[PDB]
Design a protein around this ligand. Sequence first.
Ligand SMILES: [Ca+2]
Length: 86
Amino acid sequence: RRNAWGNLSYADLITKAIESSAEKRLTLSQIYEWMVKSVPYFKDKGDSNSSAGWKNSIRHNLSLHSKFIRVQNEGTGKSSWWMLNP
DNA sequence: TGGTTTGTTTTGCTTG
DNA sequence: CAAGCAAAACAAACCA
Ligand SMILES: [Ca+2]
């Protein structure tokens, strides 16, 4: 097993999180929520004391890879919609 | 206000 | 080298 959560990469997980939404787009917070609810390894690492490292990598992957694109959100103070780049 | 989130980038290290 | 994990500097936007 490549990582402690399996053979899927962070990018792969982010992809599954987004593909799981009916609208094919999720905010950063929703992607975190999907990890904690969907990946066994992260189930007990959603708290502030242990989520810093992996959340940082999620933000890192989202910005770094062209596979993901950011879309301006609707309304005041809401963060971007993240989706798969066609 | 002043701490927290979100987002962008760069760097270090390990593998195939 | 490319893929990827991990750590981290910085800064605009948020928001309690
Ligand atoms: Ca991107």
